[PDB]
């Protein structure tokens, strides 16, 4: 395959990027504490959003509402409107740096993980966490909701990747969170985990150098395969939303795509300099992004020769 970049950012280390469902925009958090808004298309910056003390690595749009939510090594989940450009509110509670922060899709809710062994549900109307997740041994390096039922998956440096029932704080909404599955496999701590948009697939990576692909039904889990090739850590892993691919980066410097079918190796991309530390896909379009030592790079992946 080759990349077809459409927008880079120069900069110093940029930790997350976010892309806004519907605008061509992507949010950038960045080692240096700041909160970058780019318009990828015109490649301009709209805003900067200056909010908190030391490495920003949590950045996440709401899917429909001008809002987006930040995390940072300050421990704190803040809140923000772009189209008024304020810092609504800060969501205190953790303590230790805050390493995700997303949105849920159809309740009133954010979800947040911490290096303090917790993941924290806040509901954003009445600025209440409504659930403390606790269980993990270790620092929780990411936690993401499932796009159509009551789960979140999380992944530790405990080793383990955990599957959480969250149908009873739902019930309340309208017993709150129950670990349902320990994932073991993973021989050391793990740093991504990632559900498919459609498709009963978790995603894990971590320091192992292996990224994990497991199935799901209401009943159980499993583990289909590995992919093998990274030499280093790996930081963030994904699945293309609408090829059978998936998609890893890395501190050995590269991007690799994977078969999502067999696990081979279809492609990898290297930077010469720059460890990356965390790829994201736009939900509807080809438009991939990923955030390493020198800025955010925007790119379409196309098959080779494409072109």
């Known amino acids: ?63 429909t509402q001008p809002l987006f939510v930040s995390g940072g090594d300050d421990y704190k989940v803040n809140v923000w409107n772009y189209k008024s450009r304020k ?22 809710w954010i979800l947040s993980c911490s290096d303090d062994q917790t993941i924290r549900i806040w509901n954003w109307q009445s600025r209440n966490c409504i659930a403390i997740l606790t269980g993990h041994s270790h620092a929780v390096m990411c936690a993401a909701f499932h796009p159509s039922e009551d789960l979140i998956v999380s992944a530790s440096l405990d080793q383990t990747v955990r599957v959480w029932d969250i149908s009873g704080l739902r019930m ?59 030499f280093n850590n790996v930081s963030c892993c994904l699945f293309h939303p609408h090829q059978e691919l998936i998609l890893s980066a890395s501190e050995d410097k590269t991007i690799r795509v994977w078969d999502l079918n067999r696990r081979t190796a279809v492609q990898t991309f290297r930077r010469d300099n720059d460890r990356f530390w965390f790829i994201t896909v736009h939900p509807k379009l080809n438009l991939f992004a990923a955030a390493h030592d020198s800025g955010v790079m925007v790119f379409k992946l196309e098959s080779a020769w494409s072109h």
């Open 1 to 63: 395959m080759e990349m077809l970049t459409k927008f880079e950012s120069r900069s110093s280390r940029a930790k997350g990027v976010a892309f806004h469902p519907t605008q061509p925009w992507i949010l950038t958090s960045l080692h240096n504490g700041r909160i970058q808004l780019w318009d990828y298309r015109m490649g301009t910056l709209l805003d900067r959003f200056d909010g908190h003390d030391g490495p920003v690595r949590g950045i996440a749009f709401h899917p």
């Open 87 to 108: 810092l609504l509110f800060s969501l205190c509670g953790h303590m230790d740096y805050v390493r995700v922060c997303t949105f849920h899709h159809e309740y009133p």
């Open 172 to 230: 309340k909404n309208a017993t709150d969170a129950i670990v349902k599955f320990v994932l073991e496999g993973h021989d050391r701590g793990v740093n991504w985990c990632a559900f498919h948009p459609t498709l009963p697939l978790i995603l894990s990576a971590g320091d192992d150098r292996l990224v994990k692909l497991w199935r799901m039904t209401a009943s159980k889990a499993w583990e289909v395969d590995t992919c093998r090739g990274h």
